[PDB]
């Protein structure tokens, strides 16, 4: 039962968290920075995370 | 306490949802969708949506703000 | 006067009431029904009348005392069965 | 002089009396108008309210510094019913208690021309209680003087206690002019 | 007149806060205010309220100082803040009426034609709603008795907009019960219903005893209503009803029996799976 | 004397209900209002009640404060018996998460200049959907301290934290310009009871009988679905055994609903039939 | 800017055609003279 | 909070003469007073294994609405059970895998207090997975409890102390680590090295 | 002040009784709910709808779109000519009036006879013997939608 | 009552002022219906 409840709570938290855009990598310019174009709006240089 | 959890699930699976197209299954309980608003998102699949019935380029309904494939 | 338990009325007892032979108690009950005072039905095959309504009227203190006694009995029964049910289901009541 | 006042106006049937030209109703209306004008002109920061004494007492204007609204509201008062002076004075006392400004003197002016039907014992007890709550009652008598003179004197004496000149009684059996009498009354002389 | 009135949780909490405020700042027997809502047919919806200064004598029971100027000022202010709300009644937090309530309702009827009085019991009961709705109707009693201006009960209910409803749910999440029928909760609900019925019968019985002994007068409408109750009592000793009841009980119990059979079969299958898994695990651990 | 990360705003139930009502009573407008309450000592903001403000037309800004209205209602409520100062201000951000814009920062700066312990409360009526009340409380940071490098808010206790700051606020300056405050609710027992009264079920509802025709129809629907699920369950178990779940779960749900509904109605029927005679 | 709606003497009420976004109406303010500001050429609208 | 802890301290050693005050506090509506009641139960039945107190603490730990009270109840349970250190893990293990992070933190601290200066094996085993949790304060409590349990334990006696010392060093030396987790690790190192490896922690 | 505009859309599928798939024109497509006072039966695919801005609920239906061509074609049609203004062609009036009017007004004649009502007629002739006028007269007499 | 009516003229005027925050939008009036 505890596993069931924990799974449901994690699912609730993640769903209540918003979504995420999808982008195509134009070029991996510089370390920790990635130039990515996201449809439809302009192309941004993103500060890539650690993972 | 396990009750109220099914309740919150059925409540997040509400009426004013937005239709979209499920493009690909990136991984378990997560996938890429394209909202009919005209933009693509990488959202989280709710549980119990018959992954077998969730075929590529299918018509899905997403939470209006979380865009989750409810 | 007749309670709902045995509210069935008979042509013969109506005749023993206000003086009329049992060939027009039907018409009397019909007039009551039409003017809209009592409600129910008439089964003249067995010569009885079923009532399920009576135009309420102002009453007397003795009548109210009898009604109070009846409600005493009803409330006692209600309390008894409440105690029974709560005692029986004590281990699931939230 | 910082002050919060309540004009208690009687509107019983006896105000139909035509002795005061044109009628007692307009006579007392002009009386309240003039007294309110004088009191407001004296330290405008004072505030004024209006109580009507009818079969069931009523309040038409809570403590306010404006006299125009008070006069406009009073203009519609009509003669009707009978006076209930005890309820009127108690309502006035409650309103003074509720007055927003606590730095004021608790005064109540009452045009009480009528035969007041109240017990003497409770009458004097209420007068003494009002003295305890530090009330200044001004009483305008025009009407059944022969009936209410002793009771109004009891009011004044009990409220004054010793040297308590704050409470006043002015009686005008004749009807030359109510406004003239009130302006030439000792209550308004100090104002 | 108005047939129904529905109060809002916002009104309830405002009233409770007003009473607690007055009590904290000084002991008092009542607190009074105005009720703003909207009209949709004869179903009033009290969507808001606000206090007004008020005090009265407990002995004479005829002297009080409701502040009509305060009332009109704050009504205008609330009109400015939100438009679609108008004076529909007044509330007081008194467990009992008083000889003044009629006079204060007379005062309020100037502001509203169909002014509704609402008695709100801050003290929490356990059976019914905490709000009672009354309306003053005076007419020539067709009963031929002397006519005296008095109130009349009005059907009351508690209802909330979506906003207040989400708010109250978030506040109550700690003790909120499951929004679904669970067997234990349903049994408890039947027990509570029996509690309520017993209490209502006891109250009616106490009134009947009072009338019979003579401490009160006799209300013809009350006697008529209790006559209708006793006359509407059903008969459960009739054969043509006993047979139908037995039939329905048997149907329900066949459904229950099939359900229990399926549940037992599933439990046995689970136990078989557990036995197989345990034996496999022990064999693997040994080898 | 630096504020520590233990200060907490105790929003009354009345305050929260009024705020959310006003937000949904004027969405999509940026509704505004004051928050009457009393700072207790240094770590509490006890928001007794909130204060609706007329729609000023110019969105939300200091120009919408309407000082005459504010002061006159302050005095008038004080007369009513509610003597509290103006602790902070609330204003909605419909749909656009919870955070402060430039005008919001300016207004909060004015409030802090008036008294440097007030708060800025943000409520989102659209995203405060059933079961979620997305509200936030904020206060500004001082540029001198930020440049000096000393942390904007002291941390003497494990409280204050325990909350995951929203990425929206992080982007809009959840720490560069301002900082969030924990929100507690002062749920009195009496208020909790009076709220319960909302969906509290009357004894009529408790002791009533569900319609028998609809009851039989529902029983048939569920029993037939259970039959189909039983067929599928057999197929699954047989294939599993031969080779060496969802049908079982659905079967359990259906059996549970059948049992509970049937037993409830039967017991209610007996209670009624031997209570009403 | 597309038009000045005759400037209505006072209260000019200019019309703007923010590209690919929308068309709006504006008072502008903060400039010297409602007429010497602009007639039909590029302009910088404030954000909110 | 101060009054709660103070009342609990006052009613120390009184095994059974306090039951009236425990009942009153536990019935009270204030969550801080319920927490005071849990602390009072612990101090009253300190080092007694009194099963009435254990039952009350446990029922509060799974029934009450205030997560602070739940955590305090679990810690008080540890206080009750320290006298038989091997016995507590059998209880607090089931809580340790709880959905309520406050309950998890309470389980961590209860295990730490119970098996302080004992070097128990299953206690450390339970703490480890908790030492790897997504929540912050649960990790903090797990680290501190492990420090309490392993204070003055050589690798030979407890073949996990080296692993936990390396874990403490790692968790301290990190970029993205949560502040509370780092704080717990630092205090854990301090406790494990307390007294220059000459002082242990024992409640008896 | 206390009114706010809705969102014009068109239903696409009557989903579960409360769920309606509505496509907001020049925008996305939602699944929305229907408010209390509405005719779900009236709501059919292709019907216009006024959704709410915030909650996206079907506030009320709206009649099907009107093409600009059909609007100019129908809503602007001045026809007012009595049969007396068609001097000749009394017989052709008989046949036309019969076929057009009589099935419209008093179809029970056709029902009693057993024949199904007619639909249309050709009305062909040399360039100007009078056809537009002959149709205008019947349109005016029936005062129906021409 | 005319003074109160003038005050209501004032409240109407301020309502117009607040609701006429000039930065409007421009839109076609395509279609036109009524119930
Ligand atoms: N029988 C008739 N009576 C009166 N006018 C006629 C008759 N026949 C033709 N006309 C005239 O001839 C014109 C024919 O116009 P129209 O009907 O538009 O073209 P068409 O004759 O090809 O149908 C009309 O304006 C009408 O006045
Ligand atoms: Zn803002």
Listed in sequence order, the DSSP H helices in E130-238 are: 162-172, 183-213, 220-232
What whole-number distance in Å separates Cα of residue E132 and Cα of residue E123? 13
Quick check: I28 and B39 in contact, CB under 8 A?
no
Residues of chain H with Cβ-Cβ distance to A17 below 8 Å are none
CA–chain centroid gap for H150, Å, is 14
3-state secondary structure of F27: coil
* Angle made by CA atoms E74, E77, E80, in degrees to the nearest 5: 155
Which contiguous run of DSSP H or E holds residue F50? strand F44-52
Q: What would you report as the CA-atom Rg of chain I, rounded to the nearest whole angstrom?
A: 23
How many C-beta neighbours within 10 Å does residue C85 have?
19
Residue H77: closest CA among H122, H101, H47, H32: H47
Q: Which chains would you list as touching G if contact means 3+ CB atom pairs under 8 Å?
A: J
Half-sphere exposure for D61 (CA within 13 Å, toward CB): 26
Which sign does the torsion angle of CA F211, F217, F223, F228 carry?
negative
- Which of H99, H101, H134, H175 is the best substitution to test chain A (most A C-beta atoms within 10 A)? H99
Q: SS3 of D156, please?
A: helix
Domain annotation covers residue F275? no
The answer on F63 and F12 residing in a single domain is: yes
Alpha-carbon distance H116 to H201, whole Å? 6
Answer yes or no: is I127 a known binding residue.
yes
B41/B66 Cα distance (integer angstroms): 10
Q: Does residue I68 have a known ligand-binding role? A: no
Distance from the Cα of residue G46 to its chain's centroid: 11
What is the sign, positive or negative, of the torsion defined by CA atoms of H132, H133, H136, H140? Answer: negative
* DSSP E strand stretches across chain B: 18-27, 30-35, 39-43, 58-62
User: Does F122 lie in the same domain as F141?
Assistant: yes
Sign of CA dihedral D63, D65, D67, D68: negative
- Residue with CA closest to ligand 1 atom 22: I128
Residues F234 and F153 in one domain: no
Are B and A neighbours with ≥3 CB pairs closer than 8 A?
yes
Partners of residue B7 on adjacent β-strands: none
> What CA–CA distance (Å, rounded) separates D182 from E238?
88
Do F93 and F220 sit in the same domain of this protein? no
Q: How many CB atoms lie within 10 A of CB F145?
A: 13
Enumerate the H helices of chain E as residue ranges: 9-25, 68-81, 101-109, 162-172, 183-213, 220-232, 239-286
For ligand 2, the distance from its centroid to the CA atom of residue F34, given in whole angstroms, is: 14
By the 8 A CB rule, do F116 and F144 touch?
Answer: no
**Residues F253/E263, Cβ–Cβ less than 8 Å:** no
Nearest-atom number in ligand 1 for the CA of I128 is 21
DSSP D86: H
Of residues C7, C72, C94, nearest to E185 (C-beta): C94
Interatomic CA distance for residues C22 and C16, integer angstroms: 10
Residue F259 lies in a domain: yes
Q: How many whole angstroms separate alpha carbon E215 and alpha carbon E28?
A: 30
One domain, residues F175 and F112: yes
Interchain proximity B66–A8, CB inside 8 Å:
no
Q: Which residues of I touch B60 (CB under 8 A)?
A: none
CB atoms within 10 A of CB E246: 10
Residue of F nearest to J15 (CA): F57
Interchain CB distance below 8 Å, E188 and C93: yes
Element at F270 (helix H, strand E)? helix F246-273
Q: How many CA atoms lie within 13 A of H79 on its CB side?
A: 23
In a domain, F239, yes or no: yes
Residue nearest atom 16 in ligand 1 by C-alpha distance: I132
How many domains, in total, are found in chain F?
Answer: 2
The CA-to-CA distance between both ends of chain J, in Å, stands at 36
Q: What was the experiment behind these coordinates?
A: cryo-EM
Task: For residue F77, tell me if it sits in a domain.
Answer: yes
Give, as one character, the DSSP assignment of residue E3: S
Where on the phi/psi map is residue E70: left (φ > 0), alpha (ψ -120 to 50), or beta? alpha
DSSP 8-state code for residue D34: H
In this complex, is the C-beta atom of F127 within 8 Å of any C-beta atom belonging to chain B?
Answer: yes
The edge-to-edge listing of strands for the beta sheet with A33-38 is A23-27, A33-38, A43-47
Chains J and F contact (Cβ–Cβ under 8 Å for 3 or more pairs) = yes
Chains A and C touch (3+ CB pairs under 8 A): no
> Is residue F23 situated within a structural domain?
yes
The HSE-up count of residue F222 (CA atoms within 13 Å, CB side) is 24
The runs of H, that is alpha helices, within F82-178 are 102-114, 143-148, 167-171
Pairs of CB atoms within 8 A across G/J: 16
Nearest CA among E122, E30, E36 for reference residue E71: E36
- Closest C-alpha to ligand 1, atom 8: I130
Q: For residue F130, list chain B residues with Cβ-Cβ distance below 8 A.
A: 11
Q: Which helix (H) or strand (E) holds F79?
A: helix F67-80
Rounded Cα distance between F117 and E192, Å, is 49
Sheet arrangement for strand C48-54: C8-10, C48-54, C38-43
Specify whether F116 is located in the same domain as F60. yes
User: Residue D182: exposed, middle, or buried by beta-carbon count in 10 A (0-12, 13-18, 19+)?
Assistant: buried
Query: What DSSP designation does G5 have?
Result: G
Q: How many residues does chain G have?
A: 48
* Contact between residue E14 and residue E53 where contact means Cβ atoms under 8 Å apart: no
Chain pair B-F, CB pairs under 8 angstroms: 5
Q: How far is CA F246 from CA E273, F229, F236, F249, in A?
A: 16, 9, 10, 5
User: Do F158 and F234 share a structural domain?
Assistant: no
Quick check: H144 and H109 in contact, CB under 8 A? yes
CB H81 within 8 A of CB H91: yes
Measured in Å, residue F135 CA sits from the centre of ligand 2 at: 13
Residue E32 near residue E104 (C-beta atoms within 8 A): yes
Distance from the C8 Cα atom to the nearest Cα atom in chain F, whole angstroms: 17
Please indicate if any CB of chain F lies within 8 Å of the CB of I55.
Answer: no
Q: For residue F240, what are the CA distances in angstroms to C41, E273, E274, F233, F234? A: 65, 11, 15, 10, 10
Q: Which residues share a beta bridge with D105?
A: D3
> E211 CB contacts (<8 Å, ≥6 apart)?
C61, C64, E217, E218
Other Cβ atoms less than 10 A from the Cβ of I104: the count is 11
Rounded CA gap, I74 and I95, in Å?
A: 25
Give the C-alpha separation, I112 to C28, whole Å: 51
Task: Give H118-122's long-range contacts (Cβ < 8 A, gap of 24+).
Answer: H118/H85, H118/H149, H119/H149, H119/H150, H119/H153, H119/H157, H119/H158, H120/H85, H120/H86, H120/H89, H120/H149, H121/H158, H122/H86, H122/H89, H122/H93
Q: Measured between alpha carbons, how far is D1 from D101 in angstroms, rounded to an integer? A: 13
**What does the DSSP assignment read for F167-215?**
HHHHHTTTTTTEEEEEEEEE--HHHHHHHHTTTPPPHHHHH----HHHH
DSSP β-ladder status, C48-54 and C38-43: antiparallel
Whether residues F108 and F46 share a domain: the answer is: yes
* F156 contacts F3 by C-beta, under 8 angstroms: no
For chain I, say whether F52 makes contact (Cβ under 8 Å): no
Instruction: Give CA–CA dist F171/D103, Å, rounded.
Output: 55
Q: Whose CA is nearest to atom 23 of ligand 1?
A: I131
Return the best residue to mutate from I122, I128, I138 for the ligand 1 pocket (most ligand atoms within 8 A of CB): I128
The domain of F215 spans 207-270
What is the distance between the alpha carbons of residues H102 and H74, in angstroms, rounded to a whole number? 10
The pick from I81, I90, I124, I130 for probing ligand 1's pocket by mutation, whose C-beta has the most ligand atoms within 8 angstroms, reads I130
Phi/psi region, residue B39 (left: phi>0; alpha: psi -120 to 50; beta: rest), is beta
CA distance G15 to G4: 6
Q: Locate all alpha helices (DSSP H) within chain A, ordered by sequence.
A: 2-16
Phi and psi at residue F90, to the nearest 5°: -110, 150
Nearest CA to ligand 1 atom 9: I130
Do F186 and F59 belong to one domain?
yes
Tally the C-alpha atoms within 13 A of residue D136's C-alpha that lie toward its C-beta: 13
Any chains having at least 3 CB pairs less than 8 A from chain A are B, H
Judge if F112 and F243 occupy the same domain: no
User: Which of F180, F144, F265 is CA-nearest to residue F8?
Assistant: F180
Nearest atom (ligand 1) to Cα of I88: 1
> For residue D98, what is the enclosing H or E element?
helix D85-98
Q: Does F2 reside within a domain?
A: no
Q: How far apart are CA F205 and CA F195, in angstroms?
A: 19
Indicate the residue among F151, F171, F196 that finishes a domain: F196
- Asked if the bond preceding F234 is cis, omega within 30° of 0, the reply is no
According to the annotation, is I131 in a ligand binding site?
yes
Alpha carbons E94 and E100: distance in angstroms, whole number: 12
β-strand partners of B31: B43
Contact F179, F153 (CB under 8 A): yes
Are E6 and E44 in contact by the 8 Å Cβ rule? The answer is yes
Alpha-carbon span H194 to I123, nearest angstrom = 113
Exposure class string for E32-52: b at 16+ Cβ within 10 A, else e? bbbbbbeeeeeebbbbbbbbb
Distance CA H146, CA H127 (A): 7
Cβ burial, residue A1 (10 Å; 0-12/13-18/19+): exposed
Instruction: Say if E55 is an interface residue toward chain F (CB within 8 Å).
Output: no
C25 exposed, middle or buried (CB, 10 Å; 0-12, 13-18, 19+)?
buried
Q: Which of F163, F196, F229 is the last residue of a domain?
A: F196
Q: Respond yes or no on whether the N-terminal peptide bond of residue F28 is cis (omega within 30° of 0).
A: yes
Contact criterion met (CB below 8 Å) for D159 and D129: no
Q: Do J21 and F58 touch (CB under 8 A)?
A: yes
Which one of I23, I29, I51 would you mutate to disrupt binding with B, by most B Cβ within 10 Å of its Cβ? I29
Contacts of H28 by beta carbon, 8 Å cutoff, 6+ apart: H34, H37
Claim to verify: residue F114 and residue F39 sit in the same structural domain:
yes
Ligand-binding site membership of I78 (annotated)? no
Among residues F165, F196, F227, which one ends one of the domains? F196
Cα torsion D66, D69, D72, D78: sign: negative
The nearest alpha carbon in chain E to B2 belongs to E178
Cα distance between residue B18 and residue B41, in whole Å: 13
What is the dihedral sign for C-alpha H50, H53, H59, H62? negative
Give the closest residue (by CA) to ligand 1 atom 3: I86
The CA-atom distances, in angstroms, between B13 and each of A16, B18, E172, I16 are 11, 11, 22, 14
Please name the helix (run of DSSP H) or strand (run of DSSP E) that holds residue D10, with its range, or none: strand D3-10
Can you tell me the distance from the alpha carbon of H84 to that of H78, in angstroms, rounded to the nearest whole number?
10
Tell me if F45 sits within 8 A of F7, measured CB to CB. Answer: yes
Contacts for F252 with CB less than 8 Å, ≥ 6 apart = E263, E266
Please report the sign of the dihedral spanned by the C-alpha atoms of residue E76, residue E81, residue E87, residue E89: negative
Phi first, then psi: what are they for E34, rounded to 5°?
-115, 155
Distance CA H89, CA H94 (A): 9
Q: Whose CA is nearest to atom 5 of ligand 1?
A: I86
Long-range contacts from H124-130, C-beta under 8 angstroms, 24+ separation: H124/H149, H124/H150, H124/H158, H124/H160, H124/H164, H126/H89, H126/H92, H126/H93, H126/H96, H128/H160, H129/H96, H130/H96, H130/H104
Long-range contact list for I130-138, CB < 8 A, 24+ apart? I130/I86, I130/I89, I133/I81, I133/I85, I133/I86, I134/I86, I134/I89, I134/I92, I134/I93, I134/I96, I135/I96, I136/I79, I136/I80, I136/I81, I137/I81, I137/I82, I137/I83, I137/I85, I137/I86, I137/I93, I138/I96, I138/I97, I138/I100, I138/I101
Q: D44 — phi, psi (to 5°)? A: -50, -25
In angstroms, how far is the first alpha carbon of chain E from the final one?
A: 87
User: F186 with F237, same domain?
Assistant: no
Best residue among I133, I136, I138 to mutate for probing ligand 1's pocket (most ligand atoms within 8 Å of CB) is I133
Question: From CA D38, how far away is CA D44, in angstroms rounded?
Answer: 10
B10 in contact with chain F, both atoms CB, cutoff 8 A: no
Q: What is the DSSP letter of C6?
A: G
Residues with CB under 6 A from ligand 1: I 85-89, 127-133
User: In angstroms, what separates the C-alpha of F266 from chain C's closest C-alpha?
Assistant: 14
CA distance B17 to B39: 16
Q: Which chains touch E (3 or more CB pairs under 8 A)?
A: B, C, D, F, I
3-state DSSP assignment of residue I144? coil
Coil, strand, or helix at residue F29?
Answer: coil
What's the per-residue H, E or C state across chain H? Answer: CHHHHHHHHHCCCCCCCCHHHHHHHHHCCCHHHHHHHHHHHHHHCCCCCCHHHHHHHHHHHHHCCCHHHHHHHHHHHHHHHCCCCCCHHHHHHHHHCCCCHHHHHHHHHHHHHHCCCCCCHHHHHHHHHHHCCCCHHHHHHHHHHHHHHHCCCCCCCCCCHHHHHHHHHHHHCCCCCCHHHHHHHHHHHHHHCHHHCCCCCCCC
Ligand 2 centroid vs F103 CA: distance in angstroms? 7
């Amino acid at each position: 039962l505890n596993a069931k409840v924990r799974l449901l709570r994690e699912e609730l938290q993640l769903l209540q968290e918003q979504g995420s855009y999808v982008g195509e990598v134009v070029r991996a310019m510089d370390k920790k920075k990635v130039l990515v174009k996201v449809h439809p709006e302009g192309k941004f240089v993103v500060d890539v995370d650690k993972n | 306490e396990f009750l109220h959890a099914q309740e919150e699930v059925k409540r997040i699976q509400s009426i004013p949802l937005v239709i979209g197209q499920f493009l690909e299954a990136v991984d378990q309980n997560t996938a890429i969708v394209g909202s009919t608003t005209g933009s693509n998102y990488y959202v989280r699949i709710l549980s119990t949506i018959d992954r077998e019935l969730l075929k590529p380029n299918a018509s899905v309904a997403l939470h209006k703000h979380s865009n989750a494939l409810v | 006067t007749r309670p709902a338990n045995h509210r069935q009325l008979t042509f013969e007892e109506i005749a023993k009431s206000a003086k009329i032979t049992v060939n027009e108690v039907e018409l009397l009950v019909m007039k009551a029904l039409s003017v809209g005072l009592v409600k129910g039905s008439i089964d003249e095959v067995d010569k009885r009348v079923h009532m399920t309504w009576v135009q309420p009227r102002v009453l007397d203190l003795q009548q109210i005392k009898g009604m109070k006694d009846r409600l005493e009995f009803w409330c006692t029964d209600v309390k008894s069965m409440e105690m029974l049910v709560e005692h029986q289901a004590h281990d699931i009541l939230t | 002089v910082l002050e919060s006042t309540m004009v208690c106006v009687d509107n019983s049937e006896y105000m139909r009396n035509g002795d005061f030209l044109p009628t007692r109703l307009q006579a007392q209306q002009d009386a309240v108008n003039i007294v309110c004008h004088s009191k407001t002109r004296s330290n405008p920061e004072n505030n004024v309210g209006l109580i009507t004494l009818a079969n069931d007492c009523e309040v038409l204007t809570t403590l306010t510094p404006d006299t125009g609204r008070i006069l406009s509201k009073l203009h519609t008062v009509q003669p009707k019913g009978k006076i209930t002076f005890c309820t009127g004075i108690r309502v006035a006392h409650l309103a003074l208690k509720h007055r927003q400004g606590k730095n004021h003197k608790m005064r109540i002016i009452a045009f009480v021309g009528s035969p007041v039907e109240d017990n003497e014992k409770d009458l004097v007890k209420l007068a003494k209680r009002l003295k305890k709550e530090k009330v200044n009652v001004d009483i305008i008598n025009f009407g059944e003087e022969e009936v209410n003179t002793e009771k109004l004197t009891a009011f004044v004496n009990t409220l004054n206690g010793k040297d308590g000149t704050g409470s006043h009684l002015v009686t005008v059996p004749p009807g030359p002019s109510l406004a003239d009498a009130l302006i030439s009354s000792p209550i308004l002389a100090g104002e | 007149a108005v047939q129904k009135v529905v109060v809002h949780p916002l009104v309830l909490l405002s009233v409770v806060d007003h009473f607690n405020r007055i009590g904290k700042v000084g002991n008092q027997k009542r607190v009074v205010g105005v009720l703003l809502g909207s009209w949709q047919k004869k179903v009033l919806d009290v969507s808001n309220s606000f206090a007004v200064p008020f005090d009265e004598d407990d002995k004479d029971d005829s002297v009080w100082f409701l502040d009509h100027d305060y009332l009109e000022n704050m009504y205008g202010m609330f009109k400015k803040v939100n438009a679609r709300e108008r004076i529909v009644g007044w509330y007081h937090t008194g467990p009992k009426l008083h000889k003044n309530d009629i006079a204060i309702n007379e005062l309020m009827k100037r502001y509203c034609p169909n002014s509704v009085l609402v008695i709100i019991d801050v003290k929490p009961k356990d059976l019914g709603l905490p709000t009672e709705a009354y309306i003053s109707v005076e007419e020539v009693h067709d009963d031929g008795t002397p006519t005296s201006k008095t109130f009349e009960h009005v059907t009351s209910e508690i209802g909330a907009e979506e906003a207040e409803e989400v708010g109250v749910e978030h506040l109550l999440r700690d003790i909120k019960d499951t929004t679904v029928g669970t067997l234990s909760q349903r049994i408890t609900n039947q027990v509570h219903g029996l509690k309520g019925l017993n209490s209502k019968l006891l109250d009616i019985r106490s009134y009947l005893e009072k009338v019979a002994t003579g401490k009160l007068p006799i209300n013809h409408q009350i006697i008529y209503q209790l006559q209708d109750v006793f006359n509407l009592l059903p008969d459960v000793s009739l054969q043509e009803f006993v047979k139908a009841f037995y039939l329905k009980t048997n149907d329900q119990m066949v459904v229950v029996y099939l359900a229990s059979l399926i549940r037992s079969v599933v439990a046995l299958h689970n136990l078989i799976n557990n036995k197989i898994a345990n034996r496999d695990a022990e064999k693997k651990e040994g080898q | 004397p630096a504020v520590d990360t233990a200060e907490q705003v105790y929003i009354s139930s009345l305050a929260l209900l009024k705020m959310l009502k006003h937000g949904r009573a004027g969405v999509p407008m940026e509704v505004m209002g004051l928050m009457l309450g009393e700072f207790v000592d240094d770590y509490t903001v006890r928001v007794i009640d909130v204060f609706a403000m007329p729609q000023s037309g110019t969105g939300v800004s200091v120009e919408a404060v309407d000082p005459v209205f504010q002061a006159k209602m302050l005095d008038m409520l004080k007369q009513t018996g509610r003597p509290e100062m103006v602790v902070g201000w609330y204003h909605s951000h419909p749909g656009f998460g919870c955070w402060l814009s430039g005008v919001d920062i300016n207004t909060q700066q004015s409030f802090e200049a008036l008294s440097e312990r007030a708060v800025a409360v943000v409520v989102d009526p659209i995203q405060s959907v059933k079961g979620k009340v997305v509200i936030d409380a904020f206060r500004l940071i001082n540029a001198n301290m930020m440049v000096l490098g000393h942390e904007p808010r002291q941390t003497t206790s494990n409280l204050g934290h325990l909350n995951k700051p929203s990425i929206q606020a992080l982007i809009h300056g959840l720490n560069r310009h301002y900082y969030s405050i924990t929100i507690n609710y002062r749920k009195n027992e009496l208020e909790q009871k009076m709220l319960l009264n909302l969906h509290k079920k009357s004894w009529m509802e408790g002791l009533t009988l569900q319609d028998y025709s609809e009851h039989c129809k529902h029983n048939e629907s569920v029993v037939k679905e259970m039959l189909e699920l039983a067929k599928n369950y057999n197929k699954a178990v047989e294939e599993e055994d031969k080779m060496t779940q969802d049908p079982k779960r659905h079967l359990e749900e259906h059996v549970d609903v059948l049992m509970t509904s049937n037993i409830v109605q039967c017991l209610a029927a007996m209670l009624d039939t031997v209570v009403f005679k | 800017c597309t038009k000045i709606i005759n400037a209505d003497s006072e209260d000019p009420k200019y019309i703007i055609n923010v590209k690919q976004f929308a068309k709006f109406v504006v008072d502008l303010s903060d400039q010297v003279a409602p007429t010497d500001i602009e007639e039909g050429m590029r302009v910088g609208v404030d954000r909110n | 909070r101060g009054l709660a802890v103070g009342i609990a301290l006052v009613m120390y050693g009184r095994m059974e003469e306090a039951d009236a005050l425990i009942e009153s506090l536990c019935r009270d509506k204030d969550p801080i007073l319920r927490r005071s009641g849990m602390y009072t139960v612990a101090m009253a039945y300190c080092g007694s294994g009194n099963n009435k107190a254990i039952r009350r603490l446990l029922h509060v730990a799974v029934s009450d609405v205030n997560d602070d009270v739940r955590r305090a109840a679990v810690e008080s349970l540890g206080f009750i059970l320290f006298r038989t250190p091997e016995q507590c893990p059998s209880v607090v293990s089931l809580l340790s895998e709880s959905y309520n992070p406050h309950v998890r933190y309470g389980a961590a601290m209860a295990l730490g207090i119970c098996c302080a200066g004992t070097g128990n094996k299953e206690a450390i085993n339970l703490l480890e997975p908790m030492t790897n949790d997504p929540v912050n304060y649960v990790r903090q409590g797990a680290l501190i409890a492990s420090a309490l349990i392993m204070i003055q334990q050589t690798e030979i006696t407890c073949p996990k102390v080296n692993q936990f010392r390396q874990l403490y060093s790692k968790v301290i030396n990190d970029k993205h680590d949560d502040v509370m987790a780092k704080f717990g690790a630092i205090l854990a190192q301090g406790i494990l090295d307390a007294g220059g490896h000459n002082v242990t922690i024992s409640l008896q | 002040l206390q009114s706010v505009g809705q969102i014009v859309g068109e239903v696409l599928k009557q989903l579960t009784e409360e769920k309606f798939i509505v496509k907001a024109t020049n925008g996305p497509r939602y699944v929305v709910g229907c408010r209390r006072q509405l005719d779900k039966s009236k709501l059919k695919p292709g019907t216009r709808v006024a959704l709410d801005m915030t909650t996206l609920t079907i506030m009320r239906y709206l009649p099907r779109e009107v093409d600009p061509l059909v609007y100019n074609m129908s809503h602007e049609d001045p026809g007012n000519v009595s049969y007396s203004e068609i001097g000749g062609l009394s017989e052709q009036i008989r046949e036309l009036r019969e076929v057009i009017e009589l099935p419209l007004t008093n179809p029970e004649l056709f029902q009693r006879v057993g024949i199904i009502p007619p639909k249309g007629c050709l009305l062909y002739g040399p360039p100007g013997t009078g056809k537009t006028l002959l149709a205008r007269a019947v349109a005016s007499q029936l005062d129906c939608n021409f | 009552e005319l003074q109160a009516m003038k005050d209501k003229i004032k409240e109407n005027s301020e309502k117009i002022k607040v609701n006429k925050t000039l930065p409007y939008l421009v839109s076609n009036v395509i279609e036109l219906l009524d119930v």
